[PDB]
């Protein structure tokens, strides 16, 4: 409906306020900034004049693509809420836009503060509670997020947005069966914010984990709806266009000198890893992304997000020195370089990595003769000591360990070879 943005005094200056807003809507942003700055000087308590100043700064940040200008707008949106006699609709618009722009800039804790204030000021607005839940999720506070969506559901139990987010939270807590009805019903609601790749991804995954054969129906519909490159390649942080295939040869990747270095020096890489196992085993950390059905699996990470772990590299100094010659891996801010040890009785659930922007090399270091294998998409392969396998882990893949002794590999992520130097310099780290 027609939002009511003018308090009693602002209606008496609606002519001036309209003129300034007209300048802004016509794109004359600098003229509009000056007009609203004059109105704010003249009517320092006017919320609509203050809101105009903020909206003008916001439009200006967009035109200049300037984070600095947008931080100015963020403080002016707060100023609006600081004034006397702010109409409720205007108060809510100003603080909502504040939170949205804080999130855009990455100020997740500041956005959370604004969202908490919004819910205090408007306790019957369920949408604002849903937005608060997102604020919590964005700072990693799943406990409070869960409580928010529980409150929402206890008032509006058919709220689809709250259903899919509650289901996401449940699935992340390994409450797999319980998450399925929430994710499914929320997607099916078609409510705004439910048509999101994350929810198709995790609904399918939970179904696969419980043996429900409908999982690929949801993967099909997520592909059809544009969230997945295909039903098998379900990464969600993608550069569209990159060559997509589950398995690559060294020459197909162009990183032939890296592969040669890994294979020719494999015993050195092996031996440093074994020494860490023997004398510094705490550098191997258990896998902690809920990817195991059962078994023991740990990793010893030398690089992550394109940053060298200096303490870790003390444990594998020659390996780190060897790898420094290859920026295609050491500067791959969407991958890692790590030793991975897997013991008998391990099954890694089918899963996908987050991004199509990397390829993953595996160098075999200690490979039992029998029992170890990795499937990617429909092809299944085995490791060999001193040999590299390469696969695109944005494709669904699965791992088994049923030997009688441990299996050690070395994992080296590289940028997808078709990514340009500016792409490799600019993409946000994962």
């Amino acid at each position: 409906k027609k939002p009511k943005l003018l308090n009693k005094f602002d209606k008496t200056i609606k002519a001036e306020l309209d003129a300034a807003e007209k300048l802004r809507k016509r794109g004359k942003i600098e003229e509009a900034v000056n007009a609203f700055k004059e109105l704010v000087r003249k009517y320092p308590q006017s919320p609509r004049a203050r809101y105009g100043k903020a909206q003008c700064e916001d439009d200006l940040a967009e035109k200049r693509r300037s984070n600095e200008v947008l931080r100015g707008a963020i403080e002016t949106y707060q100023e609006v809420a600081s004034l006397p006699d702010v109409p409720a609709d205007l108060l809510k618009l100003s603080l909502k836009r504040r939170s949205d722009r804080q999130q855009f800039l990455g100020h997740m804790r500041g956005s959370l503060l604004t969202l908490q204030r919004l819910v205090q000021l408007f306790p019957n607005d369920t949408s604002l509670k849903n937005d608060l839940g997102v604020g919590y999720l964005l700072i990693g506070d799943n406990d409070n997020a869960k409580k928010v969506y529980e409150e929402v559901l206890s008032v509006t139990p058919n709220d689809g947005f709250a259903k899919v987010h509650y289901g996401f939270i449940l699935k992340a807590q390994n409450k797999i069966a319980e998450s399925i009805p929430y994710l499914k019903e929320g997607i099916e609601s078609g409510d705004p914010g439910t048509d999101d790749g994350r929810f198709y991804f995790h609904l399918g995954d939970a179904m696969q984990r419980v043996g429900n054969k409908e999982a690929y129906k949801w993967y099909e519909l997520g592909h059809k709806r544009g969230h997945f490159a295909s039903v098998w390649q379900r990464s969600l942080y993608n550069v569209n266009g990159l060559k997509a295939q589950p398995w690559w040869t060294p020459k197909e990747t162009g990183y032939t000198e890296l592969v040669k270095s890994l294979e020719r020096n494999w015993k050195l890489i092996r031996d440093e890893g074994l020494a860490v196992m023997d004398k510094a085993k705490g550098l191997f950390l258990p896998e902690d992304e809920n990817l195991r059905e059962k078994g023991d699996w740990s990793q010893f990470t030398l690089w992550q997000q394109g940053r060298r772990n200096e303490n870790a590299c003390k444990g594998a100094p020659k390996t780190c020195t060897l790898l420094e010659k290859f920026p295609e891996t050491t500067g791959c801010r969407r991958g890692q370089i790590k030793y991975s040890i897997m013991h008998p009785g391990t099954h890694v659930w089918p899963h996908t990595g987050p991004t199509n922007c990397r390829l993953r090399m595996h160098l075999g270091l200690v490979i039992p003769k029998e029992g170890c294998k990795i499937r990617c998409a429909n092809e299944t392969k085995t490791w060999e000591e001193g040999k590299v396998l390469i696969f695109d882990d944005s494709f669904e893949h699965e791992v088994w360990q049923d030997a009688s002794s441990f299996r050690l590999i070395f994992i080296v992520d590289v940028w997808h070879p078709e990514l340009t130097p500016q792409q490799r310099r600019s993409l946000p780290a994962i």
Binding site: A61, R65, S66, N67, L70, Q103, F104, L105, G106, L137, L138, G140, F168, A172, R198, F201, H202, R234, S235, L236, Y237, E287, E289, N290, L291, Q304, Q305, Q336, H351, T352, G353, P354, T355, D393, P428, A429, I430
Partner: peptide, 18 residues
């Protein structure tokens, strides 16, 4: 919490505006 091998976090990147 980071997305290393999987896709389990609500978001896997940190944004910084424009």
């Amino acid at each position: 919490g980071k997305c290393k091998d999987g896709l389990g976090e609500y978001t896997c990147t940190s944004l910084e505006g424009f």
